[PDB]
Amino acid sequence: RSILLTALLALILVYLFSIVGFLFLKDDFILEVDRLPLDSTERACDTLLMCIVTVMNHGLRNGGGVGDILRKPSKDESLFPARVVYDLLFFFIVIIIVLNLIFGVIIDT
Amino acid sequence: RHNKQLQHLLKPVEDPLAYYENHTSQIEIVRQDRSMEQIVFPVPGICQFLTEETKHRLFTTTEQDEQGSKVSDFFDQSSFLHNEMEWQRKLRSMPLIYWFSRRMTLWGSISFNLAVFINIIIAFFYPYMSTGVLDSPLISLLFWILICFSIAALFTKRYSIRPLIVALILRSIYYLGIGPTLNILGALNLTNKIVFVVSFVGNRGTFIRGYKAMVMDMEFLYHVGYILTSVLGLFAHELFYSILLFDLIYREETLFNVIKSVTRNGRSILLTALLALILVYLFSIVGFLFLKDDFILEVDRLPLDSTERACDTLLMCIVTVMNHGLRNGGGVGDILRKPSKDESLFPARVVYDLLFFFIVIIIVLNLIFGVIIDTFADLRSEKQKKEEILKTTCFICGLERDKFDNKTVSFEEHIKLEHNMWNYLYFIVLVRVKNKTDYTGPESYVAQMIKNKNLDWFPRMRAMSLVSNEGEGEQNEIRILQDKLNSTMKLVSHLTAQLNELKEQMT
Amino acid sequence: NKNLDWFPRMRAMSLVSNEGEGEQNEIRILQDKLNSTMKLVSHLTAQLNELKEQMT
Ligand SMILES: Nc1ncnc2c1ncn2[C@@H]1O[C@H](COP(=O)(O)OP(=O)(O)OP(=O)(O)O)[C@@H](O)[C@H]1O
Ligand SMILES: [Ca+2]
Ligand SMILES: [Zn+2]
């Protein structure tokens, strides 16, 4: 039960981050795809379910969080501080805290 | 207690005996001479207006004292319980407000379910106007799984209404559509929030007094704020419904434990973060002074070189370090230009990277957030301990279930009839309400103890059922002491008689 | 009667065979005290009987 509740909390946080990205960072969700034997890049966060799936998969499977897949910004862009804050918050909240809290109980038991 | 026939005839079976048994209560008290006696009293009518929600809260909220007794807090809450019962009795006159307030739990539960369903539907079908999931086969598989779960209701175990409501909502989406379903759910949620706030106001009874206090109450502010959020979600934009999940997080105990753990160790976290910031600042200074050219970052410019110099100023170095080095397992060295063995500063780069990795990544980062995990584990352990002790220990006396192993009375009977916290509360209310002139011996003693603020009249690790069988064992050293006292008295009497005889002979 | 007290609990005959001397320490003192009390009671009763006989 504790694992399920913590997973639901992680899902809630992922949903909030996906909403924020869709509303303010739609263009930065560009992913690289190796198409089977037609551009090599596709826009992932077009709908909302796609943003949620891409976050929950890549951000959780990447040590640095969701910021390791998003387009790399430049210092001259207006939303560079917003991107920095977004990435740091995601890394500190979802990767460092919730992920460990979900599965520490298993090791302890 | 001494006649079997009377006990047989006093069993309940409009029924007089049943009515008297229902309106009669009994408790056990300790007198000033350390003797336990049973007091049987009638339940006053006012005690019938105590809410089961209040009972449940008073049960699973009390905290043990240093010794391990909840009687202090239970007694201290007696005045609040009496006031709440009086207010409920007053509210009983009003039909509409009482009718709305009776079902406060139902309103909250259905509002919770509505919020969850609305968020799920928004996530699965926003934006709308592709609706790929509407035709994808996975939705059919989920529908079949929910149908199987609903059919499994024959085994009970609850968790059956919710999948049924989910299936109903899915069918409504299929037939009417997505937008109409969302509008209906939002309207229902708004109406439910209004009803719930009305019920809360009625239960708390702040409306009878000026509305200023009602508006001042923090919980009222919370409810009105979430009502504003709900109306914003209904009218301005659908995505505003996501804010409702904060209410769910706060309501759920396990989820709120994470926030509690984070808040409890707030100062330590802030200080450790400041230490990390200091280290990042020092590393940024060193890099700017001696490794300016190695801070080259790759940028995918929007539709003009692909590389830029990051550590030109100092704030840029600090930001790039704090972001990339902390978000990269290998540290800051995974973004910097790769040096060659023939470069003069290759050893300096190696030392810089190794020091950063060993100091900031391996030590400070873990030290910042280990406290949160430790506190969460401790809170879970404490909750489990409290739940375990609440189901295997008497609230009043504190005896464990193991004692009632083979005795004629089980632990369930002991907690239901003999030691009932609610019966003790009823006795306290009866003492407080009944006139002083009509007090009996036990009632006057209890009133005096209450006035003196002494809680020794509650039973502490003692039960009449247990002592009835333990009397033989207890009366072991007492008999020896009595025999010794009798022997000493006989010796004293013999000595006095001898002295009197000697005095008479001398005279 | 569903009583399990007939099983041995932290007791063994092999151990008690050697621990008997140590165990019989307070028991002897208690027996001596009881004997002294009984002797005192008997002496008091005899004195009372003698006093009653003299008075009669
Ligand atoms: N001293 C106690 N120790 C442990 N649990 C107790 C104690 N006193 C009450 N309880 C809890 O309260 C329950 C009895 O409460 P209460 O008499 O209000 O129940 P009820 O369902 O309203 O009764 P009924 O409908 O039969 O009149 C017990 O089953 C137990 O759950
Ligand atoms: Ca009188
Ligand atoms: Zn008891």
Numbering used by the authors:
A (entry chain D): 2367 to 2403, 2448 to 2519
B (entry chain A): 2062 to 2074, 2111 to 2226, 2230 to 2403, 2448 to 2651
C (entry chain D): 2596 to 2651
Would you copy out the relevant sentences from the publication that reported this structure?
Inositol-1,4,5-trisphosphate receptors (IP3Rs) are large, tetrameric cation channels that serve as the primary intracellular calcium (Ca2+) release channels in nonexcitable cells. Expressed in the endoplasmic reticulum (ER), IP3Rs mediate the flow of Ca2+ from the ER into the cytoplasm and other cellular compartments where Ca2+ contributes to the regulation of cell division, differentiation, metabolism, migration, and cell death. Notably, IP3Rs are inhibited by micromolar cytosolic Ca2+ concentrations, resulting in a biphasic dependence on Ca2+ for channel activity. Here, we collect electron cryomicroscopic images of human type 3 IP3R (hIP3R3) vitrified in a broad range of Ca2+ concentrations and treat particle abundance as a proxy for the relative free energy of each state to establish high-resolution thermodynamic models of IP3R activation and inhibition, which combined with cellular Ca2+ imaging elucidates the structural basis for IP3R-generated Ca2+ oscillations.
A fourth state shares the intact BTF ring and retracted ARM2 domain with the second and third states, but its pore is open, and its JD ring is disrupted. Based on the open conformation of the pore, we assigned the fourth state as an activated state. The Ca2+-binding profile of the activated state is the same as the preactivated+Ca2+ state, with an occupied JD site and an empty CD site. The pair-wise comparisons reveal that large changes to the ARM3-JD interface occur exclusively during the transition from the preactivated+Ca2+ to activated state: the JD-distal region of ARM3 rotates 6 Å towards the JD while the JD-proximal region shifts upwards 2 Å back to its resting state position. In the closed states, the four JDs assemble into a tetrameric ring structure. In the activated state, the contraction of the ARM3-JD interface induces a ~13˚ clockwise rigid-body rotation of the JDs that disrupts the inter-JD interactions. In the activated state, the rotation of the JD tilts S1-S4 towards the luminal side of the membrane, relaxing the belt around S6. In the activated state, rotation of the JD pulls the S6 helices away from the center of the pore, stabilizing a 13˚ bend and ~30˚ rotation about the helical axis of S6 with Gly2514 being the pivot for both. Together, the tilt and rotation of S6 reposition Phe2513 and Ile2517, which seal the pore in the closed states, out of the ion conduction pathway to create an open pore with a minimum radius of 4 Å. In addition to changing the dimensions of the pore, the tilt and rotation of S6 reorient the side chains of Arg2524, Asp2518 and Asp2522, switching the pore from an electropositive to electronegative environment that would be favorable for cation conductance.
